[PDB]
């Protein structure tokens, strides 16, 4: 059972977006489907739902006339057309299944804002053994000054997951975000063998594979 949302991002006030949720692992055309959203630091707010057929069904008063829910049962896809977006519409948007909301996808972030996107500078954090416990070293990547969320970080193209900690970003005075990902690896292996931060900021279409060398 999978709900895969898509189509979220940065949009200017007055602008449009079309969210999309591709479902699988169940019989799509049997279920009422729906959108629930969550402003950051706020609670869950119901957006709209749609019957297995097409009538659909009500909308939250705050989006009536502006949002339209629909579905394509042959592509197992739920849609949400968002027009006349405003700042108040900024939220994670979740695809949910059923009258009881029994399954939720991971959600897609919608940011409605005048500010333009900024790609991040990516700086390496050369390995240190000061605060790692036992013969290991901590090395990392500084992902500095991007907007909006999110950023994903992986190490060695995914082949390195044991010992990775990506920290939640700070939102600075500037309105820009920054975060760090740090990985703990054997000191013995500090140079034979190599470590690459893969940083990806989809909103600005920036990717960076940063090699992190011993200093």
């Amino acid at each position: 059972v999978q709900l895969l949302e898509s189509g979220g991002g940065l949009v200017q006030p007055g602008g449009s977006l079309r969210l999309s949720c591709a479902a699988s692992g169940f019989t799509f055309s049997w279920y009422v489907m729906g959108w629930v959203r969550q402003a950051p630091g706020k609670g869950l707010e119901w957006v709209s739902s749609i019957y297995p057929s097409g009538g659909a069904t009500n909308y939250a008063d705050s989006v009536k006339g502006r949002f339209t829910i629909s579905r394509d049962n042959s592509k197992n896809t739920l849609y949400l057309q968002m027009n006349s977006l405003r700042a108040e519409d900024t939220a994670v948007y979740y695809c949910a299944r059923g009258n009881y909301f029994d399954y939720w996808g991971q959600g897609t972030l919608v940011t409605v804002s005048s500010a333009s996107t900024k790609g991040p500078s990516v700086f390496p954090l050369a390995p240190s053994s000061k605060s790692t416990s036992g013969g290991t070293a901590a090395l990392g990547c500084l992902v500095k000054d991007y907007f909006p969320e999110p950023v994903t970080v992986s190490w060695n193209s995914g082949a390195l997951t044991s010992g990775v900690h990506t920290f939640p970003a700070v939102l600075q005075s500037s309105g820009l975000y920054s975060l760090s990902s740090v990985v703990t690896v054997p000191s013995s292996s500090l140079g034979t063998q190599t470590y690459i931060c893969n940083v990806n900021h989809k909103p600005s279409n920036t990717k960076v594979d940063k090699r992190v060398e011993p200093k």
Binding site: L44, S131, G140, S178, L179
Partner: protein, 209 residues
Amino acid sequence: SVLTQDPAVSVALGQTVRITCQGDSLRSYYASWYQQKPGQSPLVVIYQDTNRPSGIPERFSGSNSGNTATLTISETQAMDEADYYCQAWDSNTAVFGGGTKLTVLGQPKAAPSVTLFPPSSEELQANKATLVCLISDFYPGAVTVAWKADSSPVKAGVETTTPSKQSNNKYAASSYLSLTPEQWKSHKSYSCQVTHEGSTVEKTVAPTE
């Protein structure tokens, strides 16, 4: 729409907690409850007032008498710590309560791990400088972060997160100190100073390294 919830509730680990939802609408819709942990999506823990989904612990139960829905958790564990939301269908509208944040006392304290990184040569070559203080594995999730250039406190230039739960019920947090290159080279050292539950960890970093 209508539903009202208590914004915060506490319980001792092992003791029973009741989360109350009281908006009208319940007066004979049937109520669902959702659990949401930070950085995660909601799960159903109780649906149609009383029933519990396949994998939800038996200690979760629901009640509903017209006025009020109640989510009961009988022998509370550390990982019942989450946000809890009330839901009901009015007629043509799904209504959510504003949610309840559940705190579980008194889990054992954990001391912070602290890692401080100096600015990279690349960032200095880009004419900027950022000190990075990383703080993990601490509980309770309240720390104080203070920076100093040598042993003088620095005020301007500090950005600190609020602590956030990690996979293992502990907290993590970051503090960033932005400097000019000149002020980075113009001191013998900079220090990240973390205080947690009366104890203090200080990590120090020097331009001559």
